[PDB]
Amino acid sequence: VGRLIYTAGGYFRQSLSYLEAYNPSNGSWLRLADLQVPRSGLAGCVVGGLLYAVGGRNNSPDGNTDSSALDCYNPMTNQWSPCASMSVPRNRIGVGVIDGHIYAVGGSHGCIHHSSVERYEPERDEWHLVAPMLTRRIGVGVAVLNRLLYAVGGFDGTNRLNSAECYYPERNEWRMITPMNTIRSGAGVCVLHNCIYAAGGYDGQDQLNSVERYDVETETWTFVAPMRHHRSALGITVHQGKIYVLGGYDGHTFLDSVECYDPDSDTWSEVTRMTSGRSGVGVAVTMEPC
Ligand SMILES: O=C(O)C[C@H](c1ccc2c(c1)OCCO2)c1ccc2ccc(OCC(=O)NC3CCCCCC3)cc2c1
């Protein structure tokens, strides 16, 4: 009990410093301590009850700087602290957590599209590089299932991608998995039960509302119910057995809508609205603040 969905950063006209937290139990939203540096295209994750904001870019009227930052937020103090920075800036990054360690995957730095991957150790406040992916990927979706790390879709600098790959930590090795049915850049990617879900994204032409899921046992991607809204660069997380998607860009608007997927009924329902429309947010779940 007492866990909240946190949304950090994002983009609307410019990159944003907002930290806001939604309580699915009573519908409430809390505005919390701003990020020190506004960022979009960042990823959020949680280790040991601390919320981490990783990478992104600060888009401002007076410049656009890609971020190597790792900042950590303590709900007990409502304060952000700087952690050790990554080896390179990573805009439109994907992250995943295995066994208390944060993996930062891919992302862009200027015109460079990274294949490189690095691993953070909270107990040592240190980053170290691991094996790079087989494909350069920005706007990549990353999730962890059964202590394996998945990198799904993205953009390699020339083509948007339906391909996907799996990292095996004990061999420090990446291998291709079955590609998705759909090209998706900027999808929301998460894990629910034994499947990796890829929701929305941009296929090169239109923002998508389709959702597909990868069953690790069958190695197949299957479509599930589509979302109510087309969305790319959306926030995504899982909480009490349901997927929550937040925000994104639908082609026309920066969405404020939050939708919830129930796998048992295979339905999406609109559950709340963010305080303002935005895309490119980092999302993660941890205990209530204060
Ligand atoms: O396919 C690609 O080249 C990359 C892909 C993308 C680029 C251009 C697009 C697009 C999607 O579909 C909307 C119209 O053209 C992408 C993927 C992930 C992102 C994550 C965060 C993120 O954070 C800043 C952000 O939200 N930017 C927003 C305005 C500019 C468009 C990008 C989105 C809205 C941005 C991401 C962008």
Side-chain angles (χ1 to χ4, degrees):
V1 309
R3 269 193 253 189
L4 302 191
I5 297 173
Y6 286 77
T7 182
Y11 183 82
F12 172 65
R13 284 209 101 271
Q14 67 177 322
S15 299
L16 309 171
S17 59
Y18 310 149
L19 179 65
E20 294 173 327
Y22 169 67
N23 184 344
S25 275
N26 64 20
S28 70
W29 281 93
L30 274 42
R31 179 129 165 230
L32 299 172
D34 280 28
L35 286 159
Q36 312 151 96
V37 182
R39 290 130 89 181
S40 49
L42 76 164
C45 66
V46 165
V47 181
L50 301 169
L51 171 68
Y52 290 88
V54 198
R57 168 177 268 220
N58 182 5
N59 291 287
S60 93
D62 292 330
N64 303 336
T65 292
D66 295 311
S67 176
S68 66
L70 177 67
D71 299 285
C72 37
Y73 169 88
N74 186 355
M76 314 225 314
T77 75
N78 190 38
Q79 270 177 231
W80 289 94
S81 298
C83 294
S85 294
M86 298 185 292
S87 72
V88 294
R90 303 179 181 275
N91 186 34
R92 296 165 168 182
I93 193 181
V95 305
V97 175
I98 306 190
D99 189 32
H101 310 116
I102 304 174
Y103 289 79
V105 179
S108 55
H109 174 204
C111 294
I112 285 325
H113 302 87
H114 300 311
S115 62
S116 67
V117 179
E118 51 194 298
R119 214 248 307 181
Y120 180 71
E121 310 163 26
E123 61 283 10
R124 291 201 145 231
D125 189 34
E126 271 175 19
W127 288 93
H128 300 285
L129 287 152
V130 299
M133 310 174 275
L134 308 173
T135 309
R136 297 170 180 170
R137 306 176 183 271
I138 75 84
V140 58
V142 173
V144 172
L145 174 55
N146 191 35
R147 293 181 31 154
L148 299 176
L149 177 69
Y150 292 83
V152 177
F155 182 56
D156 68 7
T158 296
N159 290 125
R160 283 130 191 111
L161 303 171
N162 60 3
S163 69
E165 51 191 292
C166 182
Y167 175 73
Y168 298 82
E170 55 267 50
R171 294 192 182 158
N172 189 36
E173 173 177 342
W174 290 89
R175 307 193 179 162
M176 289 305 276
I177 62 162
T178 309
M180 292 196 286
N181 294 303
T182 313
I183 294 166
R184 308 178 186 269
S185 179
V189 170
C190 62
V191 169
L192 178 57
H193 305 329
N194 232 35
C195 309
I196 297 166
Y197 286 70
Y202 178 73
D203 68 359
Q205 200 207 17
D206 199 19
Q207 293 71 36
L208 304 166
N209 66 348
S210 66
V211 182
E212 54 188 304
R213 71 185 177 202
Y214 177 77
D215 188 312
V216 288
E217 290 317 1
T218 70
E219 294 166 37
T220 62
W221 289 92
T222 303
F223 289 94
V224 303
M227 316 184 268
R228 305 169 101 271
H229 292 92
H230 294 247
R231 334 176 165 243
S232 64
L234 57 144
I236 194 166
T237 194
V238 173
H239 179 65
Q240 302 213 334
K242 296 181 174 188
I243 300 172
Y244 292 77
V245 298
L246 296 78
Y249 177 72
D250 77 350
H252 180 67
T253 316
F254 294 76
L255 298 172
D256 53 21
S257 52
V258 179
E259 293 185 61
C260 182
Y261 179 71
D262 179 11
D264 308 299
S265 62
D266 187 31
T267 61
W268 287 89
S269 310
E270 296 245 343
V271 294
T272 195
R273 298 185 200 100
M274 292 185 292
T275 61
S276 60
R278 66 194 77 154
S279 58
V281 302
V283 183
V285 176
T286 198
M287 288 298 299
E288 316 182 10
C290 298

